[PDB]
Amino acid sequence: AEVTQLSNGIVVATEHNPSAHTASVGVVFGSGAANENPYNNGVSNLWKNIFLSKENSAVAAKEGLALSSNISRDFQSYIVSSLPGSTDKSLDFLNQSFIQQKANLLSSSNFEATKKSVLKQVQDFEENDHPNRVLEHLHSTAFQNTPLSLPTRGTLESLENLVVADLESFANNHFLNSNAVVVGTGNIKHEDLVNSIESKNLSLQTGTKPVLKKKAAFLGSEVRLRDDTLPKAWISLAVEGEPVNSPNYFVAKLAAQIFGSYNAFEPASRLQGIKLLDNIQEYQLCDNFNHFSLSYKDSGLWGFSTATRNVTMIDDLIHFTLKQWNRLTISVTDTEVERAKSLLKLQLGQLYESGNPVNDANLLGAEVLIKGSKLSLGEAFKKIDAITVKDVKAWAGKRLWDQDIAIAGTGQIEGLLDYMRIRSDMSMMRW
Amino acid sequence: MAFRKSNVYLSLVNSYIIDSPQPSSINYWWNMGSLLGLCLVIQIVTGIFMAMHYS
Amino acid sequence: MAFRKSNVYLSLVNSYIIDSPQPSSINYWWNMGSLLGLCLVIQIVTGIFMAMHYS
Amino acid sequence: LTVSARDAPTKISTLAVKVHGGSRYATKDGVAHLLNRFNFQNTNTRSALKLVRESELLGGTFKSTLDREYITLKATFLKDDLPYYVNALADVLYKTAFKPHELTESVLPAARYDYAVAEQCPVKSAEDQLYAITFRKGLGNPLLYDGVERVSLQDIKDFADKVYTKENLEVSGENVVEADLKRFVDESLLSTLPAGKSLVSKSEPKFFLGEENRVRFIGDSVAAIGIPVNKASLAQYEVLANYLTSALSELSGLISSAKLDKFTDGGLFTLFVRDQDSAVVSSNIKKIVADLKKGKDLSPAINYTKLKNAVQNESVSSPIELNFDAVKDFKLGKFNYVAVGDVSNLPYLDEL
Amino acid sequence: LTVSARDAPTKISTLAVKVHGGSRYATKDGVAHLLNRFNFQNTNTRSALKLVRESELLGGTFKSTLDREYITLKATFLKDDLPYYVNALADVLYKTAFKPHELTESVLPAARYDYAVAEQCPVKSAEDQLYAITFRKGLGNPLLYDGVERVSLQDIKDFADKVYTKENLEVSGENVVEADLKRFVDESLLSTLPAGKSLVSKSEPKFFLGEENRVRFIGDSVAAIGIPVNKASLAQYEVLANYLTSALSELSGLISSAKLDKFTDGGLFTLFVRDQDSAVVSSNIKKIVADLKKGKDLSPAINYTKLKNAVQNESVSSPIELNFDAVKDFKLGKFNYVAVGDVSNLPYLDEL
Amino acid sequence: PQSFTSIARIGDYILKSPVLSKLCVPVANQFINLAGYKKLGLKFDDLIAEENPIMQTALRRLPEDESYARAYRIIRAHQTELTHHLLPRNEWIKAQEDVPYLLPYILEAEAAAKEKDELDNIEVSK
Amino acid sequence: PQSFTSIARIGDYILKSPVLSKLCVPVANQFINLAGYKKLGLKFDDLIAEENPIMQTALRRLPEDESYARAYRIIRAHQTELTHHLLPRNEWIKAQEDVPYLLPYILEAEAAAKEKDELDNIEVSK
Numbered sequence A: 001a002e003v004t005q006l007s008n009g010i011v012v013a014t015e016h017n018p019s020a021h022t023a024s025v026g027v028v029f030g031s032g033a034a035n036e037n038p039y040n041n042g043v044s045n046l047w048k049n050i051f052l053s054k055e056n057s058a059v060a061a062k063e064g065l066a067l068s069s070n071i072s073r074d075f076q077s078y079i080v081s082s083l084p085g086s087t088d089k090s091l092d093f094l095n096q097s098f099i100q101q102k103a104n105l106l107s108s109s110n111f112e113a114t115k116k117s118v119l120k121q122v123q124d125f126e127e128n129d130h131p132n133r134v135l136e137h138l139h140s141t142a143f144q145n146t147p148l149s150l151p152t153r154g155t156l157e158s159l160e161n162l163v164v165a166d167l168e169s170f171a172n173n174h175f176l177n178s179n180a181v182v183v184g185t186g187n188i189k190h191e192d193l194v195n196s197i198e199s200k201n202l203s204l205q206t207g208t209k210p211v212l213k214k215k216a217a218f219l220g221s222e223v224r225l226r227d228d229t230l231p232k233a234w235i236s237l238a239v240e241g242e243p244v245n246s247p248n249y250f251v252a253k254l255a256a257q258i259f260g261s262y263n264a265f266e267p268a269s270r271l272q273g274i275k276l277l278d279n280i281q282e283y284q285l286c287d288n289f290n291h292f293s294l295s296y297k298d299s300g301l302w303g304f305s306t307a308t309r310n311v312t313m314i315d316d317l318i319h320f321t322l323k324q325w326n327r328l329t330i331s332v333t334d335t336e337v338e339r340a341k342s343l344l345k346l347q348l349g350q351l352y353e354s355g356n357p358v359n360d361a362n363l364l365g366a367e368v369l370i371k372g373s374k375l376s377l378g379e380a381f382k383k384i385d386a387i388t389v390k391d392v393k394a395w396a397g398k399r400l401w402d403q404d405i406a407i408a409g410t411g412q413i414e415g416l417l418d419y420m421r422i423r424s425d426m427s428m429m430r431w
Numbered sequence B, C: 001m002a003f004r005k006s007n008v009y010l011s012l013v014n015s016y017i018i019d020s021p022q023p024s025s026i027n028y029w030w031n032m033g034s035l036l037g038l039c040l041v042i043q044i045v046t047g048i049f050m051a052m053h054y055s
Numbered sequence D, E: 001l002t003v004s005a006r007d008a009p010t011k012i013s014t015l016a017v018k019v020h021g022g023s024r025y026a027t028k029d030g031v032a033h034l035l036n037r038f039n040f041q042n043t044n045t046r047s048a049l050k051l052v053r054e055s056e057l058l059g060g061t062f063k064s065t066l067d068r069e070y071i072t073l074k075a076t077f078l079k080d081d082l083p084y085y086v087n088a089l090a091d092v093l094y095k096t097a098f099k100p101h102e103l104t105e106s107v108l109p110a111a112r113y114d115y116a117v118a119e120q121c122p123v124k125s126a127e128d129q130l131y132a133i134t135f136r137k138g139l140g141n142p143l144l145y146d147g148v149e150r151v152s153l154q155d156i157k158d159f160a161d162k163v164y165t166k167e168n169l170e171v172s173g174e175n176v177v178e179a180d181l182k183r184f185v186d187e188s189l190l191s192t193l194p195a196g197k198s199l200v201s202k203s204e205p206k207f208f209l210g211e212e213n214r215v216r217f218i219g220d221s222v223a224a225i226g227i228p229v230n231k232a233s234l235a236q237y238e239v240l241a242n243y244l245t246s247a248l249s250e251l252s253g254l255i256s257s258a259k260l261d262k263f264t265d266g267g268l269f270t271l272f273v274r275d276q277d278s279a280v281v282s283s284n285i286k287k288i289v290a291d292l293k294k295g296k297d298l299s300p301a302i303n304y305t306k307l308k309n310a311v312q313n314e315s316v317s318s319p320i321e322l323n324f325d326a327v328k329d330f331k332l333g334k335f336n337y338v339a340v341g342d343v344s345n346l347p348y349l350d351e352l
Numbered sequence F, G: 001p002q003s004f005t006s007i008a009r010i011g012d013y014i015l016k017s018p019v020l021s022k023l024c025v026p027v028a029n030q031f032i033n034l035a036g037y038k039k040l041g042l043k044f045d046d047l048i049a050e051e052n053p054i055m056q057t058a059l060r061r062l063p064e065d066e067s068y069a070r071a072y073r074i075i076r077a078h079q080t081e082l083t084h085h086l087l088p089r090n091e092w093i094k095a096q097e098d099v100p101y102l103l104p105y106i107l108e109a110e111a112a113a114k115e116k117d118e119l120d121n122i123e124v125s126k
């Protein structure tokens, strides 16, 4: 596809697809959980559910409109969807919710029922969803005392002390035209969207959001949440990685694809060309693992997550996995690098060429907000095809060899050994 | 598993001086028993080298 | 359980010379290794008692 | 052989082969589940290990999926490697090995894991029961394998020879050139398959009304109702399923799920209420059935249903309901009922 | 307090205390099962260990038993040691300890073993279902404890205070002098219990007809039917239960069990067909229902039923059916049905 | 290995005596404050040795709210000693909280083991 | 530790040769009768050593009717040697029955382990 950006006072981006049967229109702001403090942690999660509340959604469903929203660390989104010949109504609804009249939504009755609904989501998350809350605690110890540590949903202790005035203060400082991108995906022409905006003289708020004092800093650390009543052990482990607008962005993504993802109960996942699986399958040390490479405006993370029921062989799983990471600096084969090139292109093709216009609106707005434009998928494939074996060794010797780590765990983790027995496995030194 | 846990002879070394679980609060009075093992090695070695010249 | 199975020191004796599982068809050529253990006990004992008179 | 394809300027292609071999055509209980977990094992020429390794270097993956009407073999790959993946799916349908040690070591343990995770969900147990009491022997057959009826290796091979036929499958492509696909299919083993018979019947199924069942279960409690639907009334019940989950309705906070499953000869409407406390479940289901018996007006939800019906029809071959124009009203008649959980504190049918 | 006893010149005596505290009076599902497994634990004065050791040197044993109407405490002992066993059963009903570690270590594991061995029998699972669909909340309550509804220690103690009352129990003796028994009961803690209320209701229960249920199960297959019976028709169905199992009938080789459960306000007739092959079960049950709908003549089995009814009334307090004189004929009307096992190959109700 | 039944037999004779409970109770209060377990955040019943069957039985029967709090006090105490420090003066155990939470479970495990031995080696009256 | 794939590679070249199969087959028939395993009630495939993964895989996949009969032949053989006797002449294994019941399961376990190693250490065509 082909993107098209403009600036008439308002930044308008679009990605037309004539094959789609729908159209999405929305606005993406360049502020998220990393632009908050510990006192108001969760105020962006309440704006999501106030936008999706029942009396607001009822007004939309009478004209054939569906609503969505998403809160992350670096951005926030508010999307409206419609049939292709009804995109003029999508913009009017968005006009009387952000540019005008966001006081009818913050009434007393609408704010108390919404608050009670959010306190029950975050409570069930902390007691039932173990893989995702251990990955949240990883961000909280790795980036402690910096903005990138705060959870995106909020906490139960900070949510209870939020009143209406906290919602209005956060909007005056962040929902600004200088911090906003208007997006359009699916079956919508680029020129029909901009002329519709020019015929209304819209302006959210002018600009100059706050300054954000501290930068993100990685600290080697651990946090353990032991619970012997649960039936598994959930563990995550990472080093410091690459931010966006880094030269090593795609080299870190390719090195995670070398070790990849595993499911013990799927037969075809046991046959992948991954050397680590010859050690794990002898005694069945885990149920699943997945390797990630996450990237933000200021820093990143590189590592893996696992879940297991073999609570007596945890130390052999962590040991064998970290000995394969060492091979990226010493001994990594040309065959392993060509496999990972092909599967990474398939992974990026499914993410960017899905059918949903709502997913494409979130990717487009976040990219334009953070580098001014969007890289094509044909240009990204050429960068991936130009990575050599020497490039992987240079990246790993800087980022992996003899470097500090962050750890988080929950469940039956008595068998997870101390920090320094694990820190020592990051360098071979039988060498 | 690791070779130090599967081999018949290294498994004993691992279970005793590498992976043995210890209380975290023991103090320096718990170090006298390792010294007594060094004392016995000193005496047996020095005495054997003198016994080559003794009558 | 029996005391020969629960005691730290008798458990080793039980596992090696009492309850050790053996093939039923082994012949008298499998008896030479026990004799070599008696030979070593003979040689060591008789040597201590001569060493008291040697120069 | 009906070949069909759409083209586009993207990087990724998708190729599917759909077979009328779901659980509604099963000879024994659970035989369509063990054939599905047997696909993409060893063939007579190529092993299963070699197929995974070869396709990883070209950038592709395979999977198979089962529902009550279809078995579907799918491939997702980079655009320019089409002819390799047409010949791989054809060997699966033609020259699969069916060796005894693959059943013991791979297929049966994987079917056992599928059944173990589904028995822990009470909403899935209730849905399986509503299908059995409404339709008794066809659509009401069980989906998965549980070992009640024993299925041998020869039963799996005799089922495959019944459903893998030229007149009983379709081939579809997304971001694929159709003239290229039709040429590679003719020079393939798909064209050498037996020309058998299609299993589809244009007769409408027989259904039953006024039935009831109860099942004890440790966990949360469920109350569910089912209504069979003919071809001419599918649109009236598609609007209802969307209106009840929407913010236009008063009962959306009392309902966990409502949907309409569509087939070529009718469908089934379903509704579910779920909660841990059993006094909440009983008081909510009673309020829903009293409101639907009075009647509703479904005209404000016509435009909202056209959007949602296009969102779920992105890349499927589109059963078309251009009947949303003539939908005004609905009132509830006779229906079926299932209760799962603390069934001593849940209501009976004659008191709803 | 109704004391009653028969005397005889034997060595062994038997003493029973019957309480109207069965599962048909349970407040929660399975609370009458945990009170039964709690009897003969520690009291406030004497431990459970000391009771077993003391009575062994005198020659006696205790046990407790549960059914849908009664809980029964029984003692079997040598004749001359009567007053020791009257005071032991009285401390059980009066000053039992109800301590938390006895529930964890003894009572709950024993109730779990009872449930595990009963779930493996398909004829018992079918009988429990026929009681539930015929009677819904009283006699149809479940007998044993399965953990669906949670029962605390205070629920067990509040049930005991409800059913252990002076107006809700009977005392009976076999090979016991009645004047001696009535004297030892008055100078006992039985006379100090609360004078509460009898739980029996002379109202006849409400029943239902034309119901159906099906249950999947790995093993053998069962087909069972149930018919509710009023007080005035108990004798007609007692002759039927004996005629069908006798050599006088053609259907005795097709039937595994047929009986009539008797209560103070009616009963339930039951019949069972059982076999591993599911084609045999279906063909036999179909032949039985076609023969009973035509009709039978039960007059040759009147004398055979008088013998069997005296063999089962040896040392029980004898509900009397002197109505066998006016029994000639029977024909089958409406009934209920349950199927357990390979339920895809077993018949439905509307085709019997 | 003095039994707890015997300790309370002696102690309750001292406490219910007027003249004895005024010379030995002040002495016993200074003995507990000089020991110093309350400054590590410990109650006395945590110090009892537990490698024997009568103490393994009492700990199984302890409620779980009180069992989870005991494990935290023991972990916090091992860590205060590896550092050669004491806790803050507002985290010390106070005299109101220094209660025998485990004594009643011990005395009933002892009375039952003694009853069993007296019956296992009894001689008959006949 | 010569592979069975290699043994059959050599053997099938001898058997399908006219001149070679008439000098080495008579020699091989006298070699089997002088060995004497058929007099203990054993077939040759029972003598193969089984303390390795390729033989553990073949024995799991053997049908159970043939597996139960193998265990009886091995127990009967340990007992016949324990007594220093031979079996009766009508209980000896005959040449018709001395068939390779386990060879086909071995050759397919070997062809799959070799295929895996060739893929685990392959170099790419590019």
Ligand SMILES: CCCCCCCCCCC(=O)OC[C@H](COP(=O)(O)OC[C@H](O)COP(=O)(O)OC[C@@H](COC(=O)CC)OC(=O)CCC)OC(=O)CCCCCCCC
Residues within 6 Å of the ligand: B027, B028, B029, B030, F084
């Ligand atoms: C003749 C042949 C002898 C040869 C063998 C010599 C070894 C004798 C050791 C005897 C002993 O075990 O006493 C231990 C006791 C320390 O008990 P603790 O664990 O609470 O202190 C941990 C420390 O605070 C952390 O000390 P840290 O771990 O930081 O460094 C240890 C280092 C000293 O570091 C310093 O600069 C001063 C702090 O080296 C040592 O301390 C070596 C060990 C002596 O020691 C003391 O300081 C107090 C007790 C005095 C003992 C005198 C009576 C013995 C005759």
Ligand SMILES: CCCCCCCCCCC(=O)OC[C@H](COP(=O)(O)OC[C@H](O)COP(=O)(O)OC[C@@H](COC(=O)CC)OC(=O)CCC)OC(=O)CCCCCCCC
Residues within 6 Å of the ligand: C027, C028, C029, G084
């Ligand atoms: C200094 C230490 C002395 C002991 C060292 C030698 C002991 C080990 C020698 C092995 C042996 O026993 O010789 C047997 C050997 C091969 O045969 P095989 O293994 O199949 O059968 C065994 C079966 O269990 C016998 O024992 P069997 O089961 O037949 O009966 C028991 C026998 C007890 O005899 C003995 O004590 C033997 C030590 O009953 C009697 O003899 C009663 C007396 C009338 O055939 C032979 O006869 C070869 C003789 C040995 C020649 C090589 C050494 C020369 C340098």
Ligand code: HEM
Residues within 6 Å of the ligand: B040, B043, B044, B046, B047, B048, B050, B051, B054
């Ligand atoms: C636990 C081990 C040992 C202890 C505690 C020990 C102790 C002693 C002592 C106290 C002396 C007298 C020291 C003096 O005043 O000269 C001595 C002498 C001697 N010991 Fe050892 N000994 C030990 C092991 C051995 C061994 C294994 C040998 C081997 C031959 C040995 C050889 C000698 C000799 C040759 C002398 C005489 C030379 C001399 O006076 O130093 N010792 N031993």
Ligand code: HEM
Residues within 6 Å of the ligand: C040, C043, C044, C047, C048, C049, C050, C051, C054
């Ligand atoms: C495996 C154990 C032993 C073996 C194989 C062995 C072997 C021998 C041999 C072959 C001789 C020469 C015999 C001769 O022709 O006189 C000898 C001499 C001697 N050995 Fe041993 N020996 C052993 C253990 C010992 C031990 C442990 C001692 C001391 C404690 C000892 C003390 C002596 C002495 C004093 C002599 C010289 C006296 C003599 O000639 O008999 N031996 N040894």
Ligand SMILES: COc1c(O)c(C)c(C/C=C(/C)CC/C=C(\C)CC/C=C(\C)CC/C=C(\C)CC/C=C(\C)CCC=C(C)C)c(O)c1OC
Residues within 6 Å of the ligand: B015, B016, B017, B020, B033, B034, B036, B037, B038, B040, B041, B044, B045, B048, B049, B052
């Ligand atoms: C609590 O945690 C611990 C722990 O902390 C330690 C340290 C240990 C280990 C402790 C020990 C004390 C080690 C044991 C030490 C011994 C048993 C000493 C044995 C010494 C010998 C057998 C002496 C060997 C000496 C020789 C053979 C001399 C060689 C002389 C030569 C070659 C000279 C040649 C000339 C002539 C004439 C012979 C534990 O087992 C342990 O438990 C888990």
Ligand SMILES: COc1c(O)c(C)c(C/C=C(/C)CC/C=C(\C)CC/C=C(\C)CC/C=C(\C)CC/C=C(\C)CCC=C(C)C)c(O)c1OC
Residues within 6 Å of the ligand: C015, C016, C017, C020, C033, C034, C036, C037, C038, C040, C041, C044, C045, C048
């Ligand atoms: C296969 O089944 C078997 C099996 O059949 C056997 C037999 C054994 C046991 C086999 C052995 C060979 C036993 C091992 C024997 C040794 C290793 C010998 C070592 C010990 C000695 C040589 C004794 C040393 C003697 C002394 C230290 C004292 C001698 C000096 C004295 C008495 C003088 C004392 C001074 C004065 C003044 C009296 C197995 O372990 C086994 O496996 C399961």
Ligand SMILES: CCCCCCCCCCCCCCCCCC(=O)O[C@H](COC(=O)CCCCCC)COP(=O)(O)OCCN
Residues within 6 Å of the ligand: B006, B007, B008, B009, B010, B012, B013
């Ligand atoms: C009480 C007496 C003391 C008893 C011993 C306890 C103290 C331990 C002794 C010191 C440990 C050193 C052992 C070496 C470790 C390697 C062993 C090994 O590789 O096992 C063997 C090879 O070892 C040998 O060749 C002989 C060992 C010589 C011993 C040197 C004295 C490898 O065998 P593996 O375990 O890999 O399995 C079979 C695969 N072919």
